[PDB]
Amino acid sequence: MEIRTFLERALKEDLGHGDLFERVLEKDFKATAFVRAKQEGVFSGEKYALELLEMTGIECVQTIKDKERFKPKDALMEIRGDFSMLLKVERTLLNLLQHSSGIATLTSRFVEALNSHKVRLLDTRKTRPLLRIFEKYSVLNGGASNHRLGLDDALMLKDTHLRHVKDLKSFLTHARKNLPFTAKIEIECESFEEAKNAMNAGADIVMCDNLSVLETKEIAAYRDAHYPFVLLEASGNISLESINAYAKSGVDAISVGALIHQATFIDMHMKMA
Amino acid sequence: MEIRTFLERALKEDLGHGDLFERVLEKDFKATAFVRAKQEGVFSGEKYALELLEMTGIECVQTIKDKERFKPKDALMEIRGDFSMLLKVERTLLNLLQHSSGIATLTSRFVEALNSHKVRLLDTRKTRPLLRIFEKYSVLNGGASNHRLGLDDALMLKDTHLRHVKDLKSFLTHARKNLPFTAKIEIECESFEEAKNAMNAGADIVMCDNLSVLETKEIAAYRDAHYPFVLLEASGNISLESINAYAKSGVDAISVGALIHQATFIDMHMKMA
Amino acid sequence: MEIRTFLERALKEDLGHGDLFERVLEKDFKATAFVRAKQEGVFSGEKYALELLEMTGIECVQTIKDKERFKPKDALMEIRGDFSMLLKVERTLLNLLQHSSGIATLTSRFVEALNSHKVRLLDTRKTRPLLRIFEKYSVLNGGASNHRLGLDDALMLKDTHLRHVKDLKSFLTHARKNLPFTAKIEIECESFEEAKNAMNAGADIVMCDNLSVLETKEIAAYRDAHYPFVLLEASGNISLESINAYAKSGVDAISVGALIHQATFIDMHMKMA
Amino acid sequence: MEIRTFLERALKEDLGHGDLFERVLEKDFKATAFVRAKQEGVFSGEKYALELLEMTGIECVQTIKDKERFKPKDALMEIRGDFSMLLKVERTLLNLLQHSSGIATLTSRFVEALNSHKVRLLDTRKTRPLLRIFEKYSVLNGGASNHRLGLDDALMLKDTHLRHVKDLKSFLTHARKNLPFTAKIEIECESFEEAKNAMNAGADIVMCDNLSVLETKEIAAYRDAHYPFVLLEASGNISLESINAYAKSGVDAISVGALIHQATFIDMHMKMA
Amino acid sequence: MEIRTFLERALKEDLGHGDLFERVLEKDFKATAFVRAKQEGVFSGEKYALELLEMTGIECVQTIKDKERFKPKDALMEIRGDFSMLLKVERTLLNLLQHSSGIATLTSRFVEALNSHKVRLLDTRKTRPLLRIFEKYSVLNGGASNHRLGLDDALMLKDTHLRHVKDLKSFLTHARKNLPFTAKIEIECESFEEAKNAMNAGADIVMCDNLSVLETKEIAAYRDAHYPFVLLEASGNISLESINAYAKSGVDAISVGALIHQATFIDMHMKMA
Amino acid sequence: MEIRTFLERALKEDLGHGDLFERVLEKDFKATAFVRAKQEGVFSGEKYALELLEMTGIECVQTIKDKERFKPKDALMEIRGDFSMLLKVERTLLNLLQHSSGIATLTSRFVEALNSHKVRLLDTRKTRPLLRIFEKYSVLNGGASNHRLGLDDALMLKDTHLRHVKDLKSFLTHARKNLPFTAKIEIECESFEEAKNAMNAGADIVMCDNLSVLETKEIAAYRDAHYPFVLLEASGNISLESINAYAKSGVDAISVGALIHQATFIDMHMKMA
Ligand SMILES: O=C(O)c1ccccc1C(=O)O
Ligand SMILES: O=C(O)c1ccccc1C(=O)O
Ligand SMILES: O=C(O)c1ccccc1C(=O)O
Ligand SMILES: O=C(O)c1ccccc1C(=O)O
Ligand SMILES: O=C(O)c1ccccc1C(=O)O
Ligand SMILES: O=C(O)c1ccccc1C(=O)O
């Protein structure tokens, strides 16, 4: 399976040479445990939690679903298995859920402020080492959308790359054959002119980077007049207090890396009840 | 190397099938790039950064060290190598330094508020999946100390465990020969009575879990009168606004997991020329 | 590096417990060897060959380049290193070059018959186990283009998927948010009607699957009239004797899986000269 | 299992970051699919197919066996499982069976042309990277035999080696104690004289590399008169139109690497309902 | 699980390219076998054996348990599975059990001659490569106790480490904020004057390296005068003929690496029947 | 390389989470150490040691070589590197050399008591888990010879395998087309009447299992009457006090697993200075 290795390594990291408690534990036995919330939020990590449990021979009697909301004291999952194994898994199972739900919850906040069904909230490639896929999955459970998953996923050209491209329209036209047939090219822009030249150069997507709502709005309109099939994305240090204003500019999407890199853990815990 | 694989995994996740730009960059060349700050903070991730650069074939001309403070606009690292590799490694490098430094910086604020040279600040086993060692290393670079690194490091018995241990003293006595000779045992207590009976049980370390400063002083005092070689640790949602008060409690260490799980990325970016 | 693991496993597979010859070999010594051609063709596998040599401490004095043509008796590479290691690497190094150049050469034939710079020749996801990336790279060196590299690369819907989609236009419109922001959706069609409905449904690409040149031509024209930004691909059992005719229908690309699955080894060998 | 990892690698390469359809398939369900033929041929890959299906959680209702012949339109396998997994595994399964069967079928035509029950047909160490064991297994399913599987299997000295061995007899004599007790030694010869002196040197097997049938009979005869326990093998661009002639040469085996490196995919496809 | 990788690798080394018998066997059938002893000793390796059979298909019908004594002829295990898999696992099963029991048994003889319950037998970091966890687990089954399991488990300082500092006091006092909070510091000493310094330094344990019983007692008693909590261990060489002598010297533990680095296999064997 | 993975894993088991000393050390410096012997024996493991130091940074200044004899006090290796890396590698370096030399040396004593050059000493498939290649390599360094290295190396039939067929003749005659062309078939026998059948069956080797010298000679001589080429091996138990006796029995080899499964470490140690 796609994430069985992820969980093995998550786990491996915690018990190193071997769990000391399992050595001292007099007799083992089947026990039931519950994962309870200590905060409110959106639950994320279900897919990873079931694989971890499966992986370790722990049964999953009950669980809420990946996009469900919850209040503190809510039981999130009811698991049953060896006492020794519930303990060896506990922190891994909880770090998983707490981290992942933290992102879904922070993300849900933005989706909320955004308030629009026509405009999409996107994440970024700013993720923590080894958690690209894990965190991207989290953002989804919060109610938003994912941007490309990597550098193989699509071509994104910004100032760094552009500074060395003599003729952009020429470059894009002739790059298409050295890129897979299905790839889209996106050009990051910092002005209306740049955006205009990008659309005419052949871009499939233009990123209005660090531009006022007015600026963006102008670009959005121009795209509507000419290049109606080119996609527009607004990006920059967009805050919760800033998102709604941008959703009205006409861009198709808004990306805020903070959805992942500014998210923190939600409080949960395991009761052997 | 120890963290060699870690760095390979972080990279793979990002280029997947292969970086696309690399396919269209007509002519590759050596270039220099700078990792600049956009926020003040404590630098962390040097050990990883340097290993990433080396296995990647990029040279490190200059770089500040693992604990230096810095302010916006400051140049943190100067690297040189193939243009194509600089771009392929960019996000991995930054995400790495921004995440590691975020934790160090956050920890930094607790080390100050704590304000002590006798009471050490510790982390927890609450760490993001696959980033334990990474996040623990990060905490060290903020000026604090580390707690055990795993379930193999030492034996820590809490509520769940204790509910099945009827006679501690005896349990702890006979547990010794089944643990590695060097292991220490720690017991979480939520009342003066629990701590007192843990000390008498033969505990090496006692945790004062969610107790007023007064409550804690009481245990600290008792430990000094009798049981002078038992380490006391206080923990329990200990905020930035209360650690200092707890530092005066008379404890040896104060553990706050938020140093890691409530930390966020420090703004940083890579710039050519 | 991206393909260092590929080569380790290629190699590992050949010497199993350990090369027997290196046991019996009296004295080792630096020797020079040449990879010579025994057929004509396009050379492919340079990127993999240099990594293998590097990996095993073999120097690469000279080599032709990945898209260069060659006649039999041509020296392709001049390598130098331990006699024992040249022998342990020989077959791996040659299977690499022979297989990879076999694909580039068969591919070059199609590019030739195609005779067009406006139309692109694409491969498919029909590759040999564990060689997806290796073979895709080969097709490029033959002078053609790659189709998506996998199922994460782009969405491709065909009869199998469509049979369960009530309203296609609705499905595509609402799928966009659950797919990364940069993904393109392609619909495989087996009639002019299907193609027409696909473009109107919202597809970014339509595949004219198993359609006469006339059929294709009709679809190509319609796309030009309406939906000028939708991409067209002709596919099916297109033969060398059939490609040129299709290149004149108006489609943007033609894909033939045979480029990879009908390619065979080119004759080469290593002379210790 | 032995081929467990192999199958994991093949799959990973295909879904990379994750299958996209899976993201948009609104409702998953169990379904049945058939693997049908579009060409006549010999079936191969059952061992791999079944392991792929099992680790993938797909059931195998029916399947023909590893050596059965088949014709177009024939249903080769009947499988059942989640719709989403059937689609994610489709290409990997087919590519696997089409490649394995291609080799078996091609080998099949040589086994016939050879037409003998005393002379066995062998493959070579010329196999596509990472597919050695896979391709060798495939050859077995065509009705032929396998040569050694690697450089550890046995010791085969050819031109390159021999140019540095001045006194074979002596070399072979003292080589024995440095090889594993069970190893056999083989020596490639390109003339009656070379073979004769190899036999006398103490060779277990002699290869008649690129020699007329007459030339070979000469060596075969000599081997029968003296050295009756030495295995003779003939090889050297031995085509489908000459093996039979060589079978009568008096050799024990005829090796042709093209059984693997000139084989191509057998047309096959997966169909629901 | 935790040692499933260990077993895959073990089994991987024996079969390599693939077991030859299975290519010969006509029809496979389910058969039973018995791991029977041919010598007297203490059984060990039940944990790995059961995991090996499970991940390998073979069914475990009956088995004595870790730490149970046995005599020649005794049947230690009864397994059930395919004729081929039993033959393929046989060697790997026995090597585990024999090497493991070999260490348990030799350990039990030191345990026996130690004759004490206030003193425990320890092992060392002197283990065969890749087998530490395996061999440490084997010692426990002999009835003794394990020492730390690696350099991450605890800090063990000796001359080479301390060659150079002036303080032990401050060195140790400051090494504390750099070690995980729960880690102990043991110091190896060679003279009373040394052990004396360690205790005044702040050590948590002291090793009396190959000293005399009269030398040890001086320290044992001194340890009681003050520093009643600091543990004492003192084997440097010790032997069966000298363990007991030390047990009555006043130390808490006696480590002897020979329990592992001097153990040899126990005769066992698998018989179908 | 081929055993670089072996070393990474070995070193990985010792440090785990990370060496503790390095978290304490103030300033690291380059230092020298000497692997000195404390016992007499035959050196082995030069191959792994040099690879371990290289991949680990430490520089190898001087070293005796595989198969060279040494006495107590003798300096076997002189290494140069960082103080930390030497301490971190020490244990892992010695365990390799000691366990390896331990096997070489014990093997050399059997070689010595065998006193023959027309008869070679073999080892068995009785090796510690994960150490076969290592231990087989260690025997060679003792001056003896290795047997097959696994079940893929050759086919070795005994009662359990043959319990059931009627023919050996046809069984073997047909097992040939299913085994790689270069593979040998050895048959273990327990009585003249058995070895007699094997030769008439077509065996390539025959093992005289724990028989008497008079029993062996009957077969040795018989082997000469007819079947001069089929090799003979005959140890079943053999010992130092009985090897020579067999060497003069007429067999080509004498295998004794005890060379490995009875070897113990050789005393060595690392000293800074
Ligand atoms: O990380 C970025 O620079 C980034 C920012 C916004 C959207 C997309 C990306 C991306 O690279 O995928
Ligand atoms: O996560 C915990 O329960 C924990 C909390 C505080 C200190 C230490 C730990 C630990 O297990 O290492
Ligand atoms: O393999 C196919 O069905 C296929 C065929 C033609 C183009 C693209 C693909 C693809 O899936 O990428
Ligand atoms: O590839 C070769 O050189 C080769 C050719 C013919 C038979 C066997 C081999 C072999 O090495 O196994
Ligand atoms: O090998 C050693 O130096 C050693 C010796 C005796 C006990 C413990 C150890 C240890 O380091 O764990
Ligand atoms: O372990 C055995 O049965 C064995 C014993 C002696 C020689 C060789 C072997 C072998 O199988 O390679």
Tell me the CATH number at D17: 3.90.1170.20
Which protein residue's CA is at the shortest distance from atom 7 of ligand 3?
Answer: C124
Amino acid at residue number A85? M
Helices and strands (DSSP H and E) totals, chain A: 11, 12
Answer for the pair C92, C52: CB distance below 8 angstroms, yes or no.
yes
Pairing of strands C69-70, C41-42: antiparallel
Contact F18 B150 (CB under 8 A): no
With 0-12 / 13-18 / 19 or more C-beta atoms within 10 angstroms meaning exposed / middle / buried, residue B71 is exposed
* Chain B contact present for E182, CB below 8 A: yes
Same domain, residue pair B258 and B268:
no
Going by their DSSP bridges, the two strands F120-122 and B268-272 should be labelled as unpaired
Number of domains within chain C: 2
Q: What span, in angstroms and rounded, lies between the C-alpha atoms of C262 and D262?
A: 9
Please give the sequence-ordered ranges of beta strands (E in DSSP) within chain C, or none if there are none.
30-37, 41-42, 59-63, 69-70, 75-82, 120-122, 155-157, 185-189, 205-209, 231-235, 253-255, 268-271
Task: Determine contact: F17 vs chain A, CB below 8 A.
Answer: yes
- Probe ligand 6: pick from F126, F208, F237, max atoms within 8 Å of CB? F126
For residues A205 and A232, is the Cβ–Cβ distance under 8 A? yes
Q: Cβ A128–B131 below 8 Å, yes or no?
A: yes
- Asked if residue A85 and residue A209 are part of one domain, the reply reads no
D50 and D160 both lie in a single domain? no
Structure tokens at C62: 């000279």
Q: Quick one: three-class SS letters along E126-166?
A: CCCCCCHHHHHHHHHCCCCCCCCCCCCCCEEECHHHHCCCC
F214 reaches E (C-beta below 8 A): no
Q: Which residues are CB-neighbours of E272 under 8 A, at least 6 positions away?
A: E31, E32, E33, E86, F160, F163
Count the Cβ atoms, other than its own, within 10 Å of residue C119: 19
Instruction: Report yes or no: C166 and D26 within 8 Å, Cβ to Cβ.
Output: no
Taking the C-alpha atoms of residue E157 and residue B6, their distance in angstroms, rounded to an integer, is 29
HEC secondary structure over chain B: CCCHHHHHHHHHHHHCCCCCHHHHCCCCCEEEEEEEECCCEECCCHHHHHHHHHHHCCEEEEECCCCCEECCCCEEEEEEEEHHHHHHHHHHHHHHHHHHHHHHHHHHHHHHHHCCCCCEEECCCCCCCCCHHHHHHHHHCCCCCCCCCCCCCCEEECHHHHCCCCCHHHHHHHHHHHCCCCCCEEEEECCHHHHHHHHHHCCCEEEEECCCHHHHHHHHHHHHHCCCCCEEEEECCCCCCCHHHHHCCCCCEEECCHHHHCCCCCCEEEEEC
Q: Which residues of A touch B83 (CB under 8 A)?
A: 164
How far, in Å, CA of B259 to CA of B44, rounded?
14
Sheet containing strand C268-271, strands side by side: C59-63, C75-82, C30-37, C268-271
Q: Which residues, in sequence order, are CB contacts of E47 under 8 Å at separation 6+? A: E3, E66, E137
Q: What angle do CA E132, E137, E139 make, to 5 degrees?
A: 100
Q: How far apart are CA A229 and CA C231, in angstroms?
A: 13
Q: Are residues A48 and A142 in the same domain?
A: no
Q: E123 near E139, Cβ under 8 Å?
A: yes
Judged by DSSP in three states, A62 sits in strand
Asked whether E188 and E214 are in contact (CB, 8 A), the reply is: no
E30, β-bridge pairs: E82
Q: Same structural domain for residues F213 and F269?
A: no
Q: Looking at beta carbons, which residues of chain E come within 8 Å of D140?
A: 23
Does residue F258 sit in the same domain as residue F131? yes
Cβ-Cβ contacts under 8 Å for C165 (sequence gap 6 or more): C157, C171
CB atoms within 10 A of CB A88: 22
**Is the distance from the beta carbon of residue F125 to the nearest atom of ligand 6 less than 6 Å?**
yes
CATH code assigned at E156: 3.20.20.70
Question: Which strands make up the sheet holding E155-157, listed edge to edge?
Answer: E120-122, E253-255, E231-233, E205-208, E185-189, E155-157
Q: Which two tokens stand for residue A34?
A: 């519950």
Is the domain of B158 the same as that of B203?
Answer: yes
Of E77, E23, E24, whose CA–CA distance to E49 is shortest?
Answer: E77
β-strands F120-122, F253-255: how paired? parallel
Q: What is the DSSP pairing of strand B30-37 with strand B268-272? A: antiparallel
Based on the domain organization, do E160 and E271 belong to the same domain? no
* Overall size of chain E counted in residues: 273
CB C186 within 8 A of CB C157: yes
Q: Whose CA is nearest to atom 11 of ligand 1?
A: A125
Alpha-carbon gap, residue C140 to B24, rounded angstroms: 12
F137: helix, coil or strand? helix
Q: Could D160 and C129 be called an inter-chain contact, meaning their C-beta atoms sit closer than 8 Å? A: no
> Please, which contacts does A110-113 make with residues 24 or more away whose CB atoms are closer than 8 Å?
A110/A142, A110/A144, A110/A240, A110/A243, A110/A256, A110/A259, A111/A142, A111/A143, A111/A144, A113/A240, A113/A241, A113/A243, A113/A244
E24: contact with F, CB 8 A cutoff: yes
Beta bridge partners, D136, equal: none
**F174 and F237 fall within a common domain:** yes
The answer to whether B38 and B68 have CB atoms below 8 angstroms apart is: no
The whole-angstrom separation of Cα F126 and Cα E94 is: 8
Q: Which residues, 6 or more positions from B34, have their beta carbon under 8 angstroms from its beta carbon?
A: B75, B76, B77, B78, B79, B270, B271, B272
Task: Please give the structure tokens belonging to residue B82.
Answer: 């193939």
Number of H helices and number of E strands within chain C?
Answer: 11, 12
For residues F126 and F98, membership in a common domain is answered with no
* Amino acid at position C163, single letter: R
Burial of C54 (0-12, 13-18, 19+ CB in 10 A): middle
Distance from CA of C16 to the nearest CA of E (A): 7
Cβ(F91) to ligand 6 under 6 A? no
Q: How would you classify the pairing of strands D231-235 and D253-255?
A: parallel
Angle between helices D83-114 and D132-140 (to 10 degrees): 60
The resolution in Å comes to: 2.5
Q: Is the CB of C147 under 6 A from ligand 3?
A: yes
Could you give the CA distance from residue F209 to residue F189 in angstroms, rounded to a whole number? 6
Output DSSP code: residue C179: S
Compute CA distances F116 → F169, F245, F248, whole Å.
34, 11, 9
The technique by which this structure was obtained is X-ray
Of D106, D37, D113, whose CA–CA distance to D72 is shortest?
Answer: D37
Domain span holding position F65: 1-116+263-273
**Could you write out the three-class secondary structure of B21-89?**
HHHHCCCCCEEEEEEEECCCEECCCHHHHHHHHHHHCCEEEEECCCCCEECCCCEEEEEEEEHHHHHHH
Active-site residue, E188 included: yes
- One domain, residues C247 and C180: yes
Q: Is B55 on the interface with F (CB under 8 A)?
A: no
- Taking one residue from B and the other from C, the number of pairs with CB-CB distance under 8 angstroms is 9
User: By CA distance, what is C133's nearest residue in B?
Assistant: B17
Q: Could you tell me which residues come within 8 angstroms of residue D247 by beta carbon, excluding any fewer than 6 positions away?
A: D114, D115, D116, D119, D254
| Other Cβ atoms closer than 10 A to D12 | 15
Helix (H) or strand (E) holding E247: helix E243-247
Given its phi and psi angles, is residue E52 left (phi above 0), alpha (psi -120 to 50 degrees) or beta? alpha
What is the residue whose two structure tokens read 């009709």?
C218
State the CB neighbour count (10 A cutoff) for residue D148. Answer: 25
How many whole angstroms separate alpha carbon B80 and alpha carbon F101? 47
How is residue F131 written in tokens? Answer: 């150490």
What is the rounded CA–CA span in Å between residue A247 and residue A225? Answer: 19
Nearest to E181 among B122, B177, B181 (CB): B122
Asked if F152 and E17 touch (Cβ cutoff 8 Å), the reply is: yes
Please classify residue E26 by burial: count the beta carbons closer than 10 Å to its beta carbon, then call 0-12 exposed, 13-18 middle and 19+ buried.
exposed
Nearest to A185, CA basis, from A198, A170, A197: A198
CA distance E124 to E122: 7
Residues E92 and E3 grouped into a single domain: yes
CA D234-D239-D244 angle, 5° bins: 65
What Å distances lie between residue B153 and A8, A22, A89, B160, E229, CA to CA? Answer: 19, 13, 16, 19, 21
Residue C85: C-alpha distances to residues C33, C64, D153 (Å): 11, 22, 17
Q: Of A11, A98, A97, nearest to A46 (Cα)? A: A97
Q: How many CB atoms lie within 10 A of CB E52?
A: 25
Q: Which ligand is nearest to the CA of C148?
A: 3
As beta bridge partners, residue E254 has E121
**Helices C132-141, C83-114: inter-axial angle, 10-degree rounding:** 60
